Amino acid sequence: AYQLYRNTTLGNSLQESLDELIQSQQITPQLALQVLLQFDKAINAALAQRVRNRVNFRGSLNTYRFCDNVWTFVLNDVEVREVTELIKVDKVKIVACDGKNTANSANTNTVPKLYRSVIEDVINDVRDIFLDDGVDEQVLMELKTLWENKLMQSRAVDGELFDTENVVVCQYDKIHRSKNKWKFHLKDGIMNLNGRDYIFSKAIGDAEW
């Protein structure tokens, strides 16, 4: 399970929650590390198995770079379409992990509240490492409540001092280029576009250098 969804509104509110409990001595930094690892699994599996929407996007390719099997792209003048909303953004950064070998598993039911299902899975799946480290249900519920509270705060109108960076964090099936014409097949994506979260199962894109 890839670590790159840790830098998302869901992944950050969890890291901040974990930081507060370390700081208050309620959990060890090493238990925190285990939780993030379980989070990686829940969000990878949740995107692969519960999310179905398609997205199409167009933009101009400004910057491109491949490193350790992760593409990073910057595009200007982007348009992202669904069935059938449209979002424009002057600038977007796409970070994509190699999803060739993943290919996750079976596809379960869609859910009304994807983040809500991920929080439940994680809390259920770290209950036992908590118990084993001497930490009881009340601390586990303190993690759940901090996580959920920080998640709400991300929606606050005056929650940021400045514009938020437009970023897609996802996987790729295939990236190609024929001359100046790039094509993107991306999957299992969380986008933060003008302050707001959007998810995707599959995203297909075009860009010109």
Residue numbers in the entry: 2 to 210
Q: What text appears in the publication on this structure?
A:
The GTF TFIIA, on the other hand, competes with NC2 for TBP and promotes TBP/DNA interactions in a ternary TFIIA/TBP/DNA complex, facilitating formation of and stabilizing the preinitiation complex (PIC). Interaction of TFIIA with TBP results in the exclusion of negative factors that would interfere with PIC formation, and TFIIA acts as a coactivator assisting transcriptional activators in increasing transcription levels. TFIIA in human cells is made from two precursor polypeptides, TFIIAαβ and TFIIAγ, with TFIIAαβ processed in vivo into two separate polypeptides, α and β, by proteolytic cleavage mediated by the protease Taspase1. Recombinant human TFIIA is typically produced in E. coli by refolding from three separate polypeptides expressed in inclusion bodies, which correspond to the native α, β and γ chains.
To facilitate recombinant human TFIIA production, we designed a single-chain construct (TFIIAs-c) by connecting α, β and γ by flexible linkers, based on atomic coordinates taken from the crystal structure of human TFIIA/TBP/DNA complex. Similarly, a second linker (L2) with sequence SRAVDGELFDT was introduced connecting the α chain with the β chain giving rise to a single-chain TFIIAs-c construct γ-L1-α-L2-βencompassing 240 amino acid residues in total. TFIIAs-c could be produced in high amounts in soluble form in E. coli and purified to homogeneity without any need for refolding steps (see Materials and methods section). We stored highly purified TFIIAs-c at 4⁰C, and observed the formation of needle-shaped crystals in the storage buffer after several weeks. We improved the crystals manually and determined the 2.4 Å crystal structure of TFIIAs-c. The crystal structure revealed a virtually identical conformation of unliganded TFIIAs-c as compared to TFIIA in the TFIIA/TBP/DNA complex. Moreover, the crystal structure highlighted the importance of the connecting loops we had introduced in stabilizing the three-dimensional crystal lattice. TFIIAs-c was active in a band-shift assay with TBP and adenovirus major late promoter (AdMLP) TATA-DNA similar to purified TFIIA using the classical refolding protocol. The structure was determined by molecular replacement (MR) utilizing software PHASER, with the TFIIA crystal coordinates from the human TBP/TFIIA/TATA-DNA structure used as a search model. Residues 2–210 could be modeled unambiguously in the electron density maps.
